[PDB]
């Protein structure tokens, strides 16, 4: 049972390390894509819907301005993002199809996930029923089991970073804070609402911060609002560090029990961080109806199927101000992004 998981994970590590040690580089060119529409813009850069002319396939192309990455001190984080994304392979992790760079920009061409962000659906509907949230939570549990076995820390879990595919399953799309680390790490990064108390308290932290963020995600999906919110991030931190969580009266006893163990300030008591590892989560009563293999194999019927008018349809995404992709005649930050 856990022997089959062990075997699966061992072959997964073998495939990952080959790509980790020998990364794919310069696999396409900007001129091979027809730029269609901006899907999103933020600290992650700009993401555009593109059409690959040689195949007619649609993709999501992330554009990062090299000079902006430098000013924002995201060089190493950007090199981590691309190195890890090109190396991983899991049903709930978005595929990196091509990467390349020019004088001005870095480009990551990923599979286009047309269902839109979980965030959009979650805010509109208000909240997900427990079976609905459990279906998505189970996919993250398996994804973190996969990632952590490769010594990867994720650090960017939130509904804004989870997309819904055509089959109703989750696609984890944001590797900007992902890092391969064996010991502890100290970078202050992530989103206020999702930060573990050890990150806020400037301690060295590890993969246990991803299990805390999962507690935050499960609560927000099932309640419609996060366990710790305020108008200012300082007030959110004050709530996270105090050891108090309040649950909606509609929360089941099993759900509250799982969430008290995930949103555990004490690391020697936090689920996912103990001797039994991920099995403390997989075997919790709230997950009793979950068939982990059927979830991985994508055999379970999804609680929600997004509206899909056709290929290239962007109705599940918000509208953004379009800006022209300007490529300078001069190479910027060549040395910094040499390995990209």
């Amino acid at each position: 049972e856990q022997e089959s998981v062990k075997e699966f994970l061992a072959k997964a590590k073998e495939d990952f390390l080959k790509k980790w040690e020998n990364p794919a580089q310069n696999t396409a060119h900007l001129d091979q894509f027809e730029r269609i529409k901006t899907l999103g813009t933020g600290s992650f850069g700009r993401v555009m819907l593109v059409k690959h002319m040689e195949t007619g396939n649609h993709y999501a192309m992330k554009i990062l301005d090299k000079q902006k990455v430098v000013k924002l001190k995201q060089i190493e984080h950007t090199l981590n993002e691309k190195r890890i994304l090109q190396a991983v392979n899991f049903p709930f992790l978005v595929k990196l199809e091509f990467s390349f760079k020019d004088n001005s920009n870095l480009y990551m061409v990923m599979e286009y996930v047309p269902g839109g962000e979980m965030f959009s659906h979650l805010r509109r509907i208000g909240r997900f029923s427990e079976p609905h949230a459990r279906f998505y939570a189970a996919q993250i549990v398996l994804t973190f089991e996969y990632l952590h076995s490769l010594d990867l820390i994720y650090r960017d879990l939130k509904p804004e970073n989870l997309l819904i595919d055509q089959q109703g399953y989750i696609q984890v799309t944001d590797f900007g804070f992902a890092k391969r680390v064996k010991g502890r790490t100290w970078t202050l990064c992530g989103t206020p609402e999702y930060l573990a108390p050890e990150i806020i308290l400037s301690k060295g932290y590890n993969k246990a911060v991803d299990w805390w963020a999962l507690g935050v995600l499960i609560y927000e999906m099932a309640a419609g609002y996060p366990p710790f919110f305020a108008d200012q991030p300082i007030q959110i931190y004050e709530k996270i560090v105090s050891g108090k969580v309040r649950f909606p009266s509609h929360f089941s006893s099993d759900l509250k029990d799982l969430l008290r163990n995930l949103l555990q300030v004490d690391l020697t008591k936090r689920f996912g961080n103990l001797k039994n590892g991920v099995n403390d989560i997989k075997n919790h009563k709230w997950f009793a109806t979950t068939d982990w293999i059927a979830i991985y194999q994508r055999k379970v019927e999804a609680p929600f199927i997004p509206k899909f008018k056709g290929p290239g349809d962007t109705s599940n995404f918000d509208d953004y101000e379009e800006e022209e992709i300007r490529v300078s005649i001069n190479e910027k930050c060549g040395k910094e992004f040499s390995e990209f």
Binding site: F119, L188, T191, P192, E193
Partner: peptide, 18 residues
């Protein structure tokens, strides 16, 4: 209600990374 307090807050949109 907590839902009404959340909806009236300035943190219901896409949240920026720190």
């Amino acid at each position: 209600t907590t839902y009404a307090d959340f909806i009236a807050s300035g943190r219901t949109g896409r949240r920026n990374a720190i």
